[PDB]
Amino acid sequence: MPMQMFMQVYDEIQMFLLEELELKFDMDPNRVRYLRKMMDTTCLGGKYNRGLTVIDVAESLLSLSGARRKRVLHDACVCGWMIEFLQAHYLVEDDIMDPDVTVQCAINDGLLLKSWTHMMAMHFFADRPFLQDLLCRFNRVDYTTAVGQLYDVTSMFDFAEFTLSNYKRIVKYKTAYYTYLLPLVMGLIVSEALPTVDMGVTEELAMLMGEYFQVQDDVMDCFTPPERLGKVGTDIQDAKCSWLAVTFLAKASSAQVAEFKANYGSGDSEKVATVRRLYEEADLQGDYVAYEAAVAEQVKELIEKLRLCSPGFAASVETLWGKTY
Amino acid sequence: MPMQMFMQVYDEIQMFLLEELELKFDMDPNRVRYLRKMMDTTCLGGKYNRGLTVIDVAESLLSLSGARRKRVLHDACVCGWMIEFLQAHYLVEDDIMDPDVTVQCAINDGLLLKSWTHMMAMHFFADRPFLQDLLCRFNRVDYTTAVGQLYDVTSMFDFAEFTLSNYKRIVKYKTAYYTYLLPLVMGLIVSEALPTVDMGVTEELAMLMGEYFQVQDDVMDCFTPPERLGKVGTDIQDAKCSWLAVTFLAKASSAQVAEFKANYGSGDSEKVATVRRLYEEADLQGDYVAYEAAVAEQVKELIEKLRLCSPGFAASVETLWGKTY
């Protein structure tokens, strides 16, 4: 039911946005169909874990606190699509990074996808008392994410920043806040229950889940093959400040560090392979198991602190964690 | 005094934003100084006509309606910088259109500049009753502008759209709403006087001033030389839906239209020159004088309708028009 409800509200949001363009912004049918196709291409096709998480938090807080129900779940669906459209926006922005009208249109797509998050909120939440608080928390997480993208893209310039604490700074802002913290906060908002929860425990939980996810993503990027990973992992070539790189640098001998530094961030096939050889021979996949296991323990423990005062909310934080773990 | 006050508030906004990054987003000094330099480079150096217009509307509505004064003018300065930062954001986005870390940083700059408009508003207007209405009208104009950019960049694909009514659609959304209508609305908002004015007359006035500006900009792009224009005009090469092109197509003979169509949108020096020859021989600069003169008359007339019910506001609309005319 949640997915069928989420997709039903997608059709409703898309029709509002596109009829708004036609009726209030003078848009011609060719461009409306063009934007409908762009929207479907960029916003549909994933798993919707960010958006479905908003729905789950909302249902938990109404079962464990009926026209208020119908309204809360619909509000939750619109907030879910706000996050999915934000994610679509970041993805387009990444694609541009890696009189040309196609690049012009990609930039425009990125502007439109972000503006659509505002446009759907201003329409569907027009009369809600939380519209202003919703816009502010959404904008702040969006800002946070751009800051984290800056931390990430500039991490190899300014290996001094190849440390675990800076790796965690990148994860926190680039990934954790909009993937884990934002869906949770948005469900609390539509449920009018934000003040009822320990936000420190909640923020701590989102950072930890985001870290668990990113370490795993980093290790798969290097070790999971493309037919199994679904893409070509290029972190070594891109000289990412990845979990593997900062962990290797701490346990490598000095000549190994020199070998790492001479070969990292190159597209050359054997320099990339020399890096994977170093990672393997330093048993980083062994280190990965224990590192994740310990993050998991801290996650489990913190959910219980949350549950003492917010049992319903904690149950949905538990559901979101299961999807990652 | 207005400029010295505007620049003083720039220092205050920049210090808030950058200290916020340092104190709440974990930013290192190297990146803070990097962002201070990027902000100065992108946001300073223009004429600030959009931002100073907000200040002017505010002063008019307090002289022609004292701690409320100090607050209103300061609010107006922050709203002015919101528009200037929005403009900085659009300029970066244009520059991208025309593992590469510099293009990555330009995209990031564009995200940051837009997010900064939200961040300064949420901080300085935190307790204002208008924060939510301000965010909504600002976001809607920002959306409008992206739609107008789409109309502009796709005007030569999908010469069927080379008409005056579509030229006016491009001008309205790409230029008029955020350059003329937005500074006026923002001054009304900080003055708590939005409901006191005929918004239809005001929107009509902004479209007309934006049209006057863009026709002039289009004709200079073709006819003003670069040392006098301050740039290389490239509308012909870029096949823009410019005022010259749609006006020529209406008065050209059929063989001239074929000559125009064979030579428009090319970087070749003599094809560009053949286009300027056609424009000249069709007396488009003659047509430009009369076209502008008639837009001016409609502007003059509408300001007076506005003044019957909103004399102070009308006086600042008159000041903004003088800067364009």
PDB file of N, CA and C in Angstrom, chain B residues 74-114:
ATOM      1  N   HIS B  74      17.222  48.049   7.230  1.00  0.00           N
ATOM      2  CA  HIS B  74      18.135  46.917   7.338  1.00  0.00           C
ATOM      3  C   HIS B  74      17.549  45.680   6.665  1.00  0.00           C
ATOM      4  N   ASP B  75      16.270  45.392   6.934  1.00  0.00           N
ATOM      5  CA  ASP B  75      15.573  44.327   6.225  1.00  0.00           C
ATOM      6  C   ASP B  75      15.689  44.512   4.717  1.00  0.00           C
ATOM      7  N   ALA B  76      15.551  45.755   4.252  1.00  0.00           N
ATOM      8  CA  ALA B  76      15.606  46.016   2.820  1.00  0.00           C
ATOM      9  C   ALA B  76      16.993  45.719   2.270  1.00  0.00           C
ATOM     10  N   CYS B  77      18.032  46.017   3.048  1.00  0.00           N
ATOM     11  CA  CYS B  77      19.387  45.711   2.604  1.00  0.00           C
ATOM     12  C   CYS B  77      19.603  44.210   2.481  1.00  0.00           C
ATOM     13  N   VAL B  78      19.067  43.428   3.424  1.00  0.00           N
ATOM     14  CA  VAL B  78      19.246  41.982   3.347  1.00  0.00           C
ATOM     15  C   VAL B  78      18.502  41.423   2.141  1.00  0.00           C
ATOM     16  N   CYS B  79      17.306  41.953   1.860  1.00  0.00           N
ATOM     17  CA  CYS B  79      16.556  41.519   0.686  1.00  0.00           C
ATOM     18  C   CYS B  79      17.276  41.907  -0.591  1.00  0.00           C
ATOM     19  N   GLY B  80      17.888  43.089  -0.608  1.00  0.00           N
ATOM     20  CA  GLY B  80      18.694  43.469  -1.756  1.00  0.00           C
ATOM     21  C   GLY B  80      19.816  42.488  -2.026  1.00  0.00           C
ATOM     22  N   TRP B  81      20.551  42.096  -0.976  1.00  0.00           N
ATOM     23  CA  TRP B  81      21.615  41.129  -1.196  1.00  0.00           C
ATOM     24  C   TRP B  81      21.074  39.763  -1.587  1.00  0.00           C
ATOM     25  N   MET B  82      19.869  39.396  -1.141  1.00  0.00           N
ATOM     26  CA  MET B  82      19.283  38.155  -1.646  1.00  0.00           C
ATOM     27  C   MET B  82      19.191  38.179  -3.168  1.00  0.00           C
ATOM     28  N   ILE B  83      18.727  39.299  -3.735  1.00  0.00           N
ATOM     29  CA  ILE B  83      18.579  39.401  -5.188  1.00  0.00           C
ATOM     30  C   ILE B  83      19.940  39.410  -5.879  1.00  0.00           C
ATOM     31  N   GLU B  84      20.891  40.171  -5.340  1.00  0.00           N
ATOM     32  CA  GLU B  84      22.242  40.199  -5.902  1.00  0.00           C
ATOM     33  C   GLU B  84      22.901  38.823  -5.860  1.00  0.00           C
ATOM     34  N   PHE B  85      22.687  38.063  -4.778  1.00  0.00           N
ATOM     35  CA  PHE B  85      23.229  36.698  -4.710  1.00  0.00           C
ATOM     36  C   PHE B  85      22.509  35.771  -5.683  1.00  0.00           C
ATOM     37  N   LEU B  86      21.199  35.958  -5.850  1.00  0.00           N
ATOM     38  CA  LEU B  86      20.478  35.199  -6.865  1.00  0.00           C
ATOM     39  C   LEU B  86      21.061  35.479  -8.246  1.00  0.00           C
ATOM     40  N   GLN B  87      21.325  36.756  -8.536  1.00  0.00           N
ATOM     41  CA  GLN B  87      21.917  37.143  -9.815  1.00  0.00           C
ATOM     42  C   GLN B  87      23.306  36.530  -9.988  1.00  0.00           C
ATOM     43  N   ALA B  88      24.143  36.601  -8.946  1.00  0.00           N
ATOM     44  CA  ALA B  88      25.429  35.903  -8.952  1.00  0.00           C
ATOM     45  C   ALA B  88      25.259  34.421  -9.291  1.00  0.00           C
ATOM     46  N   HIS B  89      24.222  33.794  -8.729  1.00  0.00           N
ATOM     47  CA  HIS B  89      23.954  32.380  -8.962  1.00  0.00           C
ATOM     48  C   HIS B  89      23.630  32.109 -10.427  1.00  0.00           C
ATOM     49  N   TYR B  90      22.742  32.911 -11.018  1.00  0.00           N
ATOM     50  CA  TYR B  90      22.427  32.737 -12.432  1.00  0.00           C
ATOM     51  C   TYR B  90      23.649  32.964 -13.307  1.00  0.00           C
ATOM     52  N   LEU B  91      24.520  33.902 -12.926  1.00  0.00           N
ATOM     53  CA  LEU B  91      25.698  34.176 -13.747  1.00  0.00           C
ATOM     54  C   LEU B  91      26.660  33.000 -13.756  1.00  0.00           C
ATOM     55  N   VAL B  92      26.921  32.410 -12.581  1.00  0.00           N
ATOM     56  CA  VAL B  92      27.735  31.194 -12.515  1.00  0.00           C
ATOM     57  C   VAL B  92      27.112  30.101 -13.364  1.00  0.00           C
ATOM     58  N   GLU B  93      25.786  29.948 -13.289  1.00  0.00           N
ATOM     59  CA  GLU B  93      25.137  28.888 -14.049  1.00  0.00           C
ATOM     60  C   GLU B  93      25.346  29.099 -15.541  1.00  0.00           C
ATOM     61  N   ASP B  94      25.258  30.350 -16.000  1.00  0.00           N
ATOM     62  CA  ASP B  94      25.515  30.646 -17.410  1.00  0.00           C
ATOM     63  C   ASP B  94      26.949  30.312 -17.796  1.00  0.00           C
ATOM     64  N   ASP B  95      27.909  30.627 -16.924  1.00  0.00           N
ATOM     65  CA  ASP B  95      29.315  30.391 -17.241  1.00  0.00           C
ATOM     66  C   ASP B  95      29.620  28.908 -17.424  1.00  0.00           C
ATOM     67  N   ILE B  96      28.949  28.036 -16.667  1.00  0.00           N
ATOM     68  CA  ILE B  96      29.143  26.600 -16.846  1.00  0.00           C
ATOM     69  C   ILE B  96      28.650  26.173 -18.221  1.00  0.00           C
ATOM     70  N   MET B  97      27.502  26.718 -18.652  1.00  0.00           N
ATOM     71  CA  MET B  97      26.945  26.432 -19.973  1.00  0.00           C
ATOM     72  C   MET B  97      27.899  26.804 -21.103  1.00  0.00           C
ATOM     73  N   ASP B  98      28.834  27.725 -20.857  1.00  0.00           N
ATOM     74  CA  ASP B  98      29.782  28.190 -21.873  1.00  0.00           C
ATOM     75  C   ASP B  98      31.080  28.709 -21.251  1.00  0.00           C
ATOM     76  N   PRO B  99      38.018  14.222 -14.532  1.00  0.00           N
ATOM     77  CA  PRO B  99      37.844  14.639 -13.131  1.00  0.00           C
ATOM     78  C   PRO B  99      38.086  16.137 -12.932  1.00  0.00           C
ATOM     79  N   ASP B 100      37.317  16.976 -13.630  1.00  0.00           N
ATOM     80  CA  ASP B 100      37.611  18.408 -13.754  1.00  0.00           C
ATOM     81  C   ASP B 100      37.127  19.170 -12.522  1.00  0.00           C
ATOM     82  N   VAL B 101      38.059  19.484 -11.614  1.00  0.00           N
ATOM     83  CA  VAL B 101      37.704  20.081 -10.331  1.00  0.00           C
ATOM     84  C   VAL B 101      37.256  21.538 -10.467  1.00  0.00           C
ATOM     85  N   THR B 102      37.636  22.241 -11.539  1.00  0.00           N
ATOM     86  CA  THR B 102      37.184  23.623 -11.685  1.00  0.00           C
ATOM     87  C   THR B 102      35.713  23.693 -12.075  1.00  0.00           C
ATOM     88  N   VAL B 103      35.263  22.800 -12.958  1.00  0.00           N
ATOM     89  CA  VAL B 103      33.847  22.748 -13.293  1.00  0.00           C
ATOM     90  C   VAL B 103      33.040  22.225 -12.113  1.00  0.00           C
ATOM     91  N   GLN B 104      33.610  21.295 -11.343  1.00  0.00           N
ATOM     92  CA  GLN B 104      32.978  20.853 -10.104  1.00  0.00           C
ATOM     93  C   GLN B 104      32.807  22.012  -9.143  1.00  0.00           C
ATOM     94  N   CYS B 105      33.820  22.867  -9.044  1.00  0.00           N
ATOM     95  CA  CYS B 105      33.730  23.976  -8.108  1.00  0.00           C
ATOM     96  C   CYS B 105      32.757  25.040  -8.599  1.00  0.00           C
ATOM     97  N   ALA B 106      32.657  25.246  -9.915  1.00  0.00           N
ATOM     98  CA  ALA B 106      31.682  26.202 -10.424  1.00  0.00           C
ATOM     99  C   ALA B 106      30.265  25.738 -10.119  1.00  0.00           C
ATOM    100  N   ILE B 107      29.987  24.448 -10.318  1.00  0.00           N
ATOM    101  CA  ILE B 107      28.661  23.934  -9.989  1.00  0.00           C
ATOM    102  C   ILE B 107      28.386  24.139  -8.508  1.00  0.00           C
ATOM    103  N   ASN B 108      29.355  23.778  -7.664  1.00  0.00           N
ATOM    104  CA  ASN B 108      29.214  23.975  -6.228  1.00  0.00           C
ATOM    105  C   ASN B 108      28.982  25.441  -5.887  1.00  0.00           C
ATOM    106  N   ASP B 109      29.749  26.349  -6.506  1.00  0.00           N
ATOM    107  CA  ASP B 109      29.520  27.779  -6.292  1.00  0.00           C
ATOM    108  C   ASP B 109      28.072  28.155  -6.573  1.00  0.00           C
ATOM    109  N   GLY B 110      27.508  27.624  -7.659  1.00  0.00           N
ATOM    110  CA  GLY B 110      26.145  27.981  -8.012  1.00  0.00           C
ATOM    111  C   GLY B 110      25.159  27.497  -6.974  1.00  0.00           C
ATOM    112  N   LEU B 111      25.384  26.290  -6.446  1.00  0.00           N
ATOM    113  CA  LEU B 111      24.544  25.789  -5.362  1.00  0.00           C
ATOM    114  C   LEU B 111      24.671  26.665  -4.117  1.00  0.00           C
ATOM    115  N   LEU B 112      25.901  27.009  -3.734  1.00  0.00           N
ATOM    116  CA  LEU B 112      26.118  27.794  -2.524  1.00  0.00           C
ATOM    117  C   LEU B 112      25.481  29.176  -2.627  1.00  0.00           C
ATOM    118  N   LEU B 113      25.650  29.851  -3.763  1.00  0.00           N
ATOM    119  CA  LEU B 113      25.113  31.207  -3.886  1.00  0.00           C
ATOM    120  C   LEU B 113      23.606  31.222  -3.708  1.00  0.00           C
ATOM    121  N   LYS B 114      22.912  30.264  -4.308  1.00  0.00           N
ATOM    122  CA  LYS B 114      21.473  30.188  -4.103  1.00  0.00           C
ATOM    123  C   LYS B 114      21.143  29.820  -2.661  1.00  0.00           C
TER     124      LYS B 114
END
